[PDB]
């Protein structure tokens, strides 16, 4: 018999993104080639099958630095990290291939699905 | 020119609640009288003006245990912690006074607003 606040989840994600922009309570650095991205492990886990597996590992759960596969493009990762914290995906003709490949590696199934749909249309 | 995934924020919150239920990456214990509640500082901050202030404090940000004011009712806190992680509020005739008082202390303005509305109707 609960009541529900429609905007609650969106408001929570908005505040988590504000914490990310201000580097508050960030507990991991994701290294992608020469580039570094600060984030919250819980948000990464909630969005990605790969980060979910990494941070549930009894040894990796305690690492402050995670290095991604050298094939991963920093821009594709940046676009996906922004999507994790906002629900908004900056999908463009020039980045769609790198975004799909990065989403497949990160195991972000809904992003992979829209990338496949957008590629099929063109 | 971004696209948006409508269910993303709700899915993120659902996964954060799954992490809470399994005690994964929880980094704080909230003590309410004899009762203890494990949670994620970032989720508490995103939902509550009080926790936002506590965990942005350069000294309190590093505490693993937070003791609430002894006037705070553990059931009211439990109902509000569940709401933080689900968007669902178990508001009942028998708990509405304790829920409103706890939401005022925690600075959860939308919960305070619906409690005032529900009390006014009766």
């Amino acid at each position: 018999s609960c009541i529900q606040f429609t905007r609650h989840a969106s408001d929570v994600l908005l505040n988590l993104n504000r914490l990310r922009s201000r580097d508050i309570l960030t507990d991991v650095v994701i290294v992608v080639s020469r580039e570094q991205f600060r984030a919250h492990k819980t948000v990464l886990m909630a969005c990605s099958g790969l980060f979910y597996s990494i941070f549930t590992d009894q040894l990796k759960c305690n690492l402050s630095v995670i290095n991604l596969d050298p094939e991963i493009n920093p821009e594709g990762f940046c676009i996906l990290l922004d999507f994790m914290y906002t629900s908004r995906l900056n999908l463009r003709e020039g980045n769609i291939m790198a975004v799909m490949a990065t989403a497949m590696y990160l195991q972000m199934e809904h992003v992979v699905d829209t990338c496949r749909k957008f590629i099929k249309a063109s | 020119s971004c696209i948006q995934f409508t269910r993303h924020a709700s899915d993120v919150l659902l996964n954060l609640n799954r992490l809470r239920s399994r005690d994964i990456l929880t980094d704080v214990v909230i003590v309410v009288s004899r009762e203890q509640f494990r949670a994620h500082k970032t989720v508490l901050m995103a939902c509550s003006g009080l926790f936002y202030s506590i965990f942005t404090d350069q000294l309190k940000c590093n505490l693993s245990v937070i003791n609430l004011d002894p006037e705070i009712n553990p059931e009211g806190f439990c109902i509000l912690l569940d709401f933080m992680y689900t968007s669902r509020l178990n508001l009942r005739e028998g708990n509405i006074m304790a829920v409103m008082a706890t939401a005022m202390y925690l600075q959860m303005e939308h919960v305070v607003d619906t409690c005032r509305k529900f009390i006014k109707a009766s």
Binding site: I3, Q4, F5, T6 | -
Partner: peptide, 4 residues
């Protein structure tokens, strides 16, 4: 607020 809604009835979910």
């Amino acid at each position: 607020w809604v009835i979910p």
